[PDB]
Amino acid sequence: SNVWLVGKTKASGAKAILLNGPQFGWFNPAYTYGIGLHGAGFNIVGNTPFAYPAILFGHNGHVSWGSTAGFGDGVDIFAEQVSPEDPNSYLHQGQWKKMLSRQETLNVKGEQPITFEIYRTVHGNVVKRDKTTHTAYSKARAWDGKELTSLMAWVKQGQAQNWQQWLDQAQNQALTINWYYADKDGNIGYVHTGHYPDRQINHDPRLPVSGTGEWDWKGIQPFANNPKVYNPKSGYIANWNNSPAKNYPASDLFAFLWGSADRVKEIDNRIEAYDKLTADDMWAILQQTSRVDLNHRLFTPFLTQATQGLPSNDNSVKLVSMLQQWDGINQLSSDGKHYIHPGSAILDIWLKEMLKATLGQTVPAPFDKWYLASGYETTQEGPTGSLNISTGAKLLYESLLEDKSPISQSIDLFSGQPQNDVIRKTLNTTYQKMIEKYGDNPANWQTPATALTFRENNFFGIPQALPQENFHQNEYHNRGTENDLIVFTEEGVSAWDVVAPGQSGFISPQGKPSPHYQDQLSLYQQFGKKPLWLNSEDVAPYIESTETLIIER
Amino acid sequence: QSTQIKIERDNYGVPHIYANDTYSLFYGYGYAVAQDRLFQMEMAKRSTQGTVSEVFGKDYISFDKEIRNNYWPDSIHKQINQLPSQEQDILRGYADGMNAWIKQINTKPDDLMPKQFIDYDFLPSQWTSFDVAMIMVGTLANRFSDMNSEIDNLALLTALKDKYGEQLGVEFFNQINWLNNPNAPTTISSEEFTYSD
Ligand SMILES: [Ca+2]
User: Fold this and answer.
1) Which residues of A are part of the catalytic machinery?
2) Cβ-based neighbours of A446, under 8 Å, separated by 6 or more
3) Using the beta-carbon criterion (under 8 Å), do A38 and B46 form an inter-chain contact?
4) Rounded Cα distance, A420 and B129, in Å
5) DSSP letters of A475-515?
6) B173 belongs to a structural domain
7) Chain A contact for B98, CB < 8 A?
8) What domain count does chain A have?
9) Which residues bind Ca(2+) (chain B) (predicted)?
10) Cis amide leading into A29 (omega within 30)
């Protein structure tokens, strides 16, 4: 998920612009739902996931907002000490406590119902057991018990009319979610929201801690610790799930890191290139970032270094040359099944080689696998979500960076071999694989383009449409599942968004889809957008249907 | 006594709800959603509550056990009862609006029943405040606030030490799964905000 906003200092022809790109995968029907709520203290237009009462992407005419996932660490594992004769009794604060439990019965189509038991201790639900060490791991969440209050701070921030009113809701939102603010006066703000444990000194949040009580959280950290900014010096705010602020600790997830190499630079760089951006310039960065290969900017300079000194006709130099001459921006071939440049396929193969040669050699099986992916692992249907520099590649980059990386390389990823040797070697291998997979004449190499699918199964693997009730888009776009562009102008607010395939997923028993079943697909693919109407006079000309309900109360 | 809700749809079929009280406002919102995305919502409910096997069979047993094993319904029902009444009307209203439209479908199902229900051979459920709460809890909280790999990390660390000895096994782990890296590009300038505690 990415987002970028500019205030009065950098906004052009506007007081503030906010472009949000939430990433959730692509689905049919659409992941998000458009809506306008007018009355009873509400005046909001936007679109939101699963049609939640809380509208995540929108504005109220005074304040616009958006968000990206936070990835902070508000969830620790507690290794409960289980009684050797009652796995459901655990030791905590001096007492052998009985675990809370509950029976759940699953009706199963075509079988007899199945019942199983779920346990919960003082720290959270029991998530796994290790009988050999009398352990029952339980998941402690800093947001447990605060779900509803968080959902409600989430509907209430939508009624905020200023920065202080908005902060009063942000403080009550407990999930690790980044929130963005822009307003009619040109003020912009950001708050990495969430409740984070005030842990016992020396509690490594990356590994389980004993649940006998000595390691219990002391409390919840105060809102004042939460990274936030109001009208940053830079004149802009951008995020693509990167770190909020210096020294901020990410989730314990092994796969997730905020390191030297970070996709957010693709955004910052583009924004800094302009003195003031119009809403059209802002939308331009969306097309750019959707197509830019993320590893190109990071890795080519190392490729250039290792091959300096080799002649022009050297094979690994043919490759480096193709890359140094590329802008990183992928384009679909005329047949729509290929890329016009072979750069991604090169970076992909090269990276896979490098990783087996570095982390693949230093990280013991089967964990090496957590670091061998290049990040291009596509499917027939395309990536399921956004594309990022992989865990392995961030770690490889950290190492290549040598003295420029502040992280001590306790284990030499390269195992003593000069890194330029390894780079040269893996480049030579890359060249041969490219030659063998795409032919002898590089001019005729036709590398496969990554497609995108609006899948019939939700992000959970659960069918939410009929089999094959999906949509295919030739060109993958590393952009939000939806995009909304909101602009506070001298006149007021102009906003736009796109919710593909469409607003409705209805298909009559007869097999007739709604007229809005897929009227936004092409709009998505072509980087278009439709208007977001807030007020009655400007929505008026576009009303196609009215329904009046008199509800008995 | 009654209240009047107005639902105006634009050229892209987007619903704009007009009501004078919270309960009515959300009731109209829930109604427009049942019109537009009933099957999507019905499966989102079975997904966030683990009752997919009920309609799709054995293949979904693990999924269901897994979903139900990761939340404590008691906590959710209680939090809802604790919300102020106006906030309770938000959920209850939405739930009722959904149900009001399901009522129209049952009136003339030959035209209003989403085809997926007919082909998968099952019916639209009855919606509650708990059902609405869970859509968010299951697709938001459990999606962007419940990630954790600490048990695996324990295994990673164990395996590093085994391979490199305790001290170096530990340093390698902080090398590859650091707590933080001071050089990570950040959204806030370090001057404006540097993290402490
Ligand atoms: Ca943790």
Assistant:
1) 1
2) A333, A338, A438
3) no
4) 61
5) S---S-SSEEEEEE-SS-EEEEEE-SS-S---B-TTSPBPT
6) yes
7) no
8) 3
9) 150
10) yes
